[PDB]
Amino acid sequence: FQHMGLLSTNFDMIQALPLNVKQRVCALKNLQMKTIQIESDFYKRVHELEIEFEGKFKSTFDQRKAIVAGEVEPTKEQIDTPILEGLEGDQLAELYKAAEADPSAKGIKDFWLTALRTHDLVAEAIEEHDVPILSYLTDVTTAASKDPAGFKIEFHFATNPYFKNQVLTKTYLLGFDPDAEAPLQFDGPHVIRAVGDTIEWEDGKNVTKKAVKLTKTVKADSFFNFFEPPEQAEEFLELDYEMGQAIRDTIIPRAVLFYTGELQSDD
């Protein structure tokens, strides 16, 4: 939406409109605000629908966590599901013959690390010094709330030499109402605030900070700046939100498709 009306694509046509026709356009602008208000109620119902479906998704996500952690064994029906699709003529058989079973290998190692770094947007945020930290990721979950309106993403870490936290939490507070100061701009839920999490780093493991020479501490590039959210700092919030949306909406529901790399981009 272009707030500067003089930059409107059809401004010259609007300016030339007779006055009585201009006032009809003014009525449509007023009606447009009412349409957007109804849209705001629609998105609120969808948000409640997403909350309602957490209980329905929960058992498939729980079983995936147990499989990844090695806490339950695949069934006969699960073994009979092809690991990849579109393999013809003994290709699937040879795939299963490529590596003998290893009883020392438990669960699926580096499942979430592999899934996160195969998504192109999240891969850009993952630096090399984040890779061994994300190896300790055992689960990634998300839940939404009605009051305060928003959602969180939680990253569960096994005991690791990098930080003491078991769970790193990222929370987004969302606004579902149109801005009363700019009602025509509303195009869905928008971020009011992002709340991160204090990471209890062990000595010398904080890859998110580095000193520069007076001596001052500055931000270093790392995925774990996801948990310390903020002129152009407002776009940085939008990029942070877009990464949060990708994890919640795309990666978490289809994690194994990113683990295998069956989901691809061509941007």
Partner: protein, 181 residues
């Protein structure tokens, strides 16, 4: 570093040999070729841009690294392919992808992200991944062309590793370029 170009190598194969396949083992070798040539080109472009002005890797630094790594005739054709893709990308415009704007199959966006991630320089210009994608695509197309020829000379429709081996070792410039891999 372990990056997969299999989907893009496959689409190049269908342009070069429409009714020819490639085995998974031969695809892994093709990925090793592209990754190794990428790392050598980027490392040389990084050296030329270590104390560049603004430490910028542009199409200039890629082109110079292309001339250093690639042998004679391979370098001239890769250069011509690089300038053509940059020229087409500069005058290009549903939202089209960067590779389609450059007329390429190899991923311009991902190569831009890999160049930025590797910290080869402070800034990576938009023309550098376009030029680099065209060079890696040309090299893949040349290898796939001769491997596909060796495949059907062996009365096969699927490129096997030995077809990749003979195609490289029997071409003087491709053999010198990919000997170490």
């Amino acid at each position: 570093r372990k990056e997969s170009y299999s989907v893009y190598i496959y689409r190049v194969l269908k342009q070069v040999h429409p009714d020819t396949g490639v085995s998974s083992k031969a695809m892994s070798i093709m990925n090793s070729f592209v990754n190794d040539v990428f790392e050598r080109i980027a490392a040389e472009a990084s050296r030329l841009a270590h104390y560049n002005k603004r430490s910028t890797i542009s199409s200039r630094e890629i082109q110079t690294a292309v001339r250093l790594i690639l042998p004679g005739e391979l370098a001239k054709h890769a250069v011509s392919e690089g300038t053509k893709a940059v020229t087409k990308y500069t005058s290009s415009k549903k939202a089209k992808s960067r590779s389609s704007r450059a007329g390429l199959q190899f991923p311009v966006g991902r190569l831009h992200r890999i160049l930025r991630k590797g910290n080869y320089a402070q800034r990576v210009g938009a023309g550098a991944p376009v030029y680099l994608a065209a060079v890696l695509e040309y090299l893949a197309a040349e290898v796939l062309e001769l491997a596909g020829n060796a495949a059907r000379d062996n009365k096969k429709t699927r490129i096997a590793p030995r077809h990749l081996q003979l195609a490289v070792r029997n071409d003087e410039e491709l053999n010198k370029l990919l000997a170490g891999v």
